[PDB]
Structure 1
Amino acid sequence: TRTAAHTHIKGLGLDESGVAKRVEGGFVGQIEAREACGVIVDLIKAKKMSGRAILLAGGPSTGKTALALAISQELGPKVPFCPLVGSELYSVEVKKTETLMENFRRAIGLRIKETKEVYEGEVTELTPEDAENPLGGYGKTISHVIVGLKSAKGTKTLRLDPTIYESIQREKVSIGDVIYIEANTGAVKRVGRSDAYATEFDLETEEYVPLPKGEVHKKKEIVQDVTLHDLDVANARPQGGQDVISMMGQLLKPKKTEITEKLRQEVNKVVAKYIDQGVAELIPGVLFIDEVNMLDIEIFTYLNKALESNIAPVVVLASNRGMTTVRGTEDVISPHGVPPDLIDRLLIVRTLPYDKDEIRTIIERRATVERLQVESSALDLLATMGTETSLRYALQLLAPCGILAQTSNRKEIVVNDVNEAKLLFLDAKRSTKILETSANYL
């Protein structure tokens, strides 16, 4: 078990058709922001809209990323979620517009149901039966291939096409191997050798797979979850070109290229065609961009362009700046570092700072998650610590308090332990104070 300043956040914690409980789901306070995020989660689950932008605005250490992760856990693992930093779009292999568009396409998922009818198992015989009056000038003209497959409780003799036989030569299928044939394509697949057929007792490099379970003939419905960016990446590269430059690019570094809009529209129209047949289901997800103040003005204008498309997902933005200059500009003072046209294109959810009791309950919840026992007086001192200093400093001081408690052979965290941890590790404000007082290039 590992904790990473999260994983106490288990969803948002709203009840059905109602007001958020104050302490529920690892969340303390932020009732209006959690209600707005629940409304956004229901809008995403409605599966109807495209390119809706929410900006989480508040101070530092107020729970914007916690709310985004709560949205992601409320949506479930099947709905796609792409976390992102504003600094990640400045790639040096491809232009920043292409990175933004591929992160947009990474947050649109496709669920495809399909039927696989297969014959698999350990093989018993391979008789390429010759035809009567077998032409002339050729040896062993095959009328059909008889393959005897066996598995757990099942044994089936199959009369295959002659043209599978060269595939038999292709995958090096011998008697005693565990093979796998799809009915629609008729392509064999040598999984390995049976465990009972380990004849070479001394030295062998074969992969001995167990004998597969169930009947030989199995027809099953499987569900595959992909993203639209996966389809774009798989369709961009030459799929089995079998030429010199294809293997050259296979062996080379996979450099990122500007995926054209034509390929995206082709993928979109084939996806819509298979959606109309009912075999595929489209799900939109969340592209979360934290600290969008690091985005360039070109990123903001391309965001204005790309939010109007019919495909784009719900984009959750976060920012902690209040009234600052937009990156890429020199005199554009804007709220949250976001230009007014994009600000016009989104909805703003405000996040509030916390109180003493909320900070105390957050510290106690983090102590219970990290499996640390803190007494009440040390908890009150940590709450006063989190009010005088930052909340994150009091949250991150819990683990040194646990180390200093366990080094004295006790499980409770004592006021002496948190005083020692205060003396050992410094706050940002106290470090700034001793940087101002000391003029020795500290």
Structure 2
Amino acid sequence: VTRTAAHTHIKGLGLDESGVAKRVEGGFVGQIEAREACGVIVDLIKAKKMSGRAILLAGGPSTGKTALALAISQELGPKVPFCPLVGSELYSVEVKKTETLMENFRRAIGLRIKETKEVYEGEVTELTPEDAENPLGGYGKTISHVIVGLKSAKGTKTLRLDPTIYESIQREKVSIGDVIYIEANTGAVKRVGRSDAYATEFDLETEEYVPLPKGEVHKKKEIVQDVTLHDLDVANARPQGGQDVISMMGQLLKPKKTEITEKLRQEVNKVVAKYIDQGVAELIPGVLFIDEVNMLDIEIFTYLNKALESNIAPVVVLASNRGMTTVRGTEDVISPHGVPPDLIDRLLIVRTLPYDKDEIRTIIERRATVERLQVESSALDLLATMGTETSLRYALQLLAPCGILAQTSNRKEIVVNDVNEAKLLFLDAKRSTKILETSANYL
């Protein structure tokens, strides 16, 4: 019926109105201090005043570092932008890593804008172009004006096109008996389809049929749009949308990333400031999440030191699972969590703790409940002592072969013999390493 993949039993942090977390609610078990710290961070993000705050989730493997960030993302909701990222995404073969980090920084700041649209829409009744006096003069186009007749409900208008508008009229291949939609902001034309006032079944081009639009031909409407600053940056970097030559040829060329200069970002910032000053736009700071932050090298860390001190940058969350690991790109320095101390001095570190046996048992119970399976209590205890023996992830991932082997014997419950069979078929890292050490030819 539904699909589950390593998550989606987690819905949020699951706190009270005072920020005190429960023992088990919202898909989480334990981790009370980390969930309270993440709730404080979520409240700080919702305060919408701070710029460039950074926390780091420090812990071991399989302890719930990605789950806390996903719970933060679901606690904020789809209204606030959230940009997930891996540490290996910053190395591109098209542009430098500093520009990619700047791009992902600007991709986490949103904006909500109420925008006015001037529209001419209706059914085309007549389309008559008139010719120029000399068409082969070299300078000046073939035609001079085109007369179009638009008919809508309770209205009929006649328009005289600029030829520049007529090029975008003709490129979507409109004709007599066609419903169109002209947006006066950019000159873009949408061909809705044939009007249903005429015949229907006599066509051979799988078209759709639309009635006449309600209201007058000329309209002004209010569309509420959501956007990021990075969208404006890539719109002004590669200009498409106009009716001139350059914006027309920009749609056909291959798109490529470029180093967007700071001057364009300052101009976009000034225009956005003018927009919010008028009472039109509203600014939404967001979250940038970077998992496996130890893959970053020293140059990206040194640029992060500069980028966190700007007055635009959002809240950035990091994660790592290294104790005393040398920083990549350096040769001798050893720093905690693979993160250099000059950036460590600007972070807030949140510890994540391992679990006990009963916590592993109830996590396995919730995972078996979510994946729609029925597990016997003795099999649950065997899975719990297996999870304490080897790993939590190994006990979690062996539930579905247990379900398949229980289904193949025409049964719904999972029993001890099924768990023993799944133990015999699939191995873990420790038994595989013990096979590797006492091996003949690098088995």
- TM-score, normalization by structure 2: 0.87
Q: Is the 8 Å Cα contact of residues 146 and 158 (structure 1) preserved in structure 2?
A: yes
Q: Secondary structure at the match of 1:23?
A: coil
Q: Secondary structure at the match of 1:190?
A: strand
Q: Is the 8 Å Cα contact of residues 130 and 140 (structure 1) preserved in structure 2?
A: no
Q: For structure 1, which segment, 409-418 or 316-325, has the greater mean C-alpha deviation from structure 2 after superposition?
A: 409-418
Q: Taking structure 1 as reference, are residues 121 and 16 closer, same or farther at Cα in structure 2, changes over 3 Å only? A: farther
Structure 2: unaligned runs, 5 residues or longer: none
RMSD between aligned alpha carbons? 4.1
Q: Secondary structure at the match of 1:163?
A: helix
Q: Secondary structure at the match of 1:113?
A: strand
Number of residue-to-residue matches in the alignment: 442
Distance of 1:393 and 1:39 partners within structure 2? 33
Q: For structure 1, which segment, 122-131 or 100-109, has the greater mean C-alpha deviation from structure 2 after superposition?
A: 122-131
Per the alignment, residue 342 of structure 1 pairs with 343
Shift, 1:18, TM fit: 2.9
Per the alignment, residue 239 of structure 2 pairs with 238
Percent same amino acid among aligned pairs? 100
Distance of 2:296 and 2:163 partners within structure 1? 61
Q: For structure 1, which segment, 351-360 or 123-132, has the greater mean C-alpha deviation from structure 2 after superposition?
A: 123-132
Shift, 1:154, TM fit: 8.3
Q: Taking structure 1 as reference, are residues 225 and 240 closer, same or farther at Cα in structure 2, changes over 3 Å only? A: closer
Q: Taking structure 1 as reference, are residues 121 and 232 closer, same or farther at Cα in structure 2, changes over 3 Å only? A: same
Per the alignment, residue 45 of structure 2 pairs with 44
Distance of 2:51 and 2:138 partners within structure 1? 66
Q: Is the 8 Å Cα contact of residues 81 and 288 (structure 1) preserved in structure 2?
A: yes
Q: Is the 8 Å Cα contact of residues 108 and 228 (structure 1) preserved in structure 2?
A: yes
Distance of 2:133 and 2:343 partners within structure 1? 77
Distance of 2:264 and 2:182 partners within structure 1? 32
Distance of 1:320 and 1:209 partners within structure 2? 58
Q: Is the 8 Å Cα contact of residues 187 and 242 (structure 2) preserved in structure 1?
A: no
Shift, 1:79, TM fit: 1.1
Q: Taking structure 1 as reference, are residues 374 and 150 closer, same or farther at Cα in structure 2, changes over 3 Å only? A: farther
Q: Deviations over 1:248-301 (max 9, x none)?
A: 664443222111111111111211121111111111111111111111011111
Shift, 1:162, TM fit: 11
Q: Taking structure 1 as reference, are residues 37 and 210 closer, same or farther at Cα in structure 2, changes over 3 Å only? A: farther
Q: Is the 8 Å Cα contact of residues 231 and 267 (structure 1) preserved in structure 2?
A: yes
Distance of 1:95 and 1:127 partners within structure 2? 53
Shift, 1:401, TM fit: 1.0
Q: Taking structure 1 as reference, are residues 336 and 236 closer, same or farther at Cα in structure 2, changes over 3 Å only? A: same
Q: Taking structure 1 as reference, are residues 374 and 338 closer, same or farther at Cα in structure 2, changes over 3 Å only? A: same
Q: Is the 8 Å Cα contact of residues 186 and 243 (structure 2) preserved in structure 1?
A: no
Distance of 1:167 and 1:304 partners within structure 2? 48
Q: Is the 8 Å Cα contact of residues 118 and 180 (structure 1) preserved in structure 2?
A: yes
Q: Deviations over 1:35-87 (max 9, x none)?
A: 11111111111111111111000000111100011111111112111111111
Q: Deviations over 1:306-354 (max 9, x none)?
A: 0000111111000010111011111111100000110001100111101
Q: Deviations over 1:14-53 (max 9, x none)?
A: 1222301111111111111011111111111111111111
Q: For structure 1, which segment, 132-141 or 154-163, has the greater mean C-alpha deviation from structure 2 after superposition?
A: 132-141
Distance of 2:374 and 2:291 partners within structure 1? 33
Q: Taking structure 1 as reference, are residues 198 and 204 closer, same or farther at Cα in structure 2, changes over 3 Å only? A: farther
Q: Is the 8 Å Cα contact of residues 168 and 243 (structure 2) preserved in structure 1?
A: no
Shift, 1:212, TM fit: 4.9
Structure 1: unaligned runs, 5 residues or longer: none
Q: Taking structure 1 as reference, are residues 412 and 179 closer, same or farther at Cα in structure 2, changes over 3 Å only? A: same
Q: Secondary structure at the match of 1:180?
A: strand
Q: Deviations over 1:139-170 (max 9, x none)?
A: 99999999775667988899999997787666
Shift, 1:225, TM fit: 1.1
Shift, 1:362, TM fit: 1.1
Shift, 1:244, TM fit: 7.7
Distance of 2:260 and 2:364 partners within structure 1? 47
Shift, 1:204, TM fit: 3.6
